[PDB]
Structure 1
Amino acid sequence: VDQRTRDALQRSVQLAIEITTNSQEAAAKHEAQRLEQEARGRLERQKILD
């Protein structure tokens, strides 16, 4: 019945959306770091072979 209550719940749903976007950005950052380290390791082994 109270409008303030519904307005308070809108902040809850926008915080849930912000949480989901932060989660996908963190997953992308960790995949980027894994590929970066794999390429760096292959590059170092190739420099020693050269």
Structure 2
Amino acid sequence: TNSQEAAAKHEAQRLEQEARGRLERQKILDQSEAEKARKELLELEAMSM
């Protein structure tokens, strides 16, 4: 039972790892387009200031 538990544990841990890695990459991506819109806002803010 300790063996099967170790298997399910390692598996769920690896899956959560790959998942958090995906969501992390999506975070960096969303930060990228947000950086784009922020850049345009910096342009309009530049001309306005």
TM-score (norm 2): 0.77
**4+ residue stretches of structure 1 with deviation over 2 A?**
46-50
Summarize deviations over 1:2-50 as a string: whole Å, max 9, x none.
x321221110001011001101110110001111111111122123335
Separation in structure 2 between the aligned mates of residue 36 and residue 45 of structure 1, nearest angstrom = 14
Gap regions ≥5 residues in structure 2? none
Separation in structure 2 between the aligned mates of residue 12 and residue 47 of structure 1, nearest angstrom = 51
Specify the alignment match of 2:4 in structure 1.
6
Gap regions ≥5 residues in structure 1? none
Number of corresponding residues: 48
Which structure is larger by alpha-carbon Rg, 1 or 2? 1
Q: Are 1:42 and 2:40 matched, yes or no?
A: yes
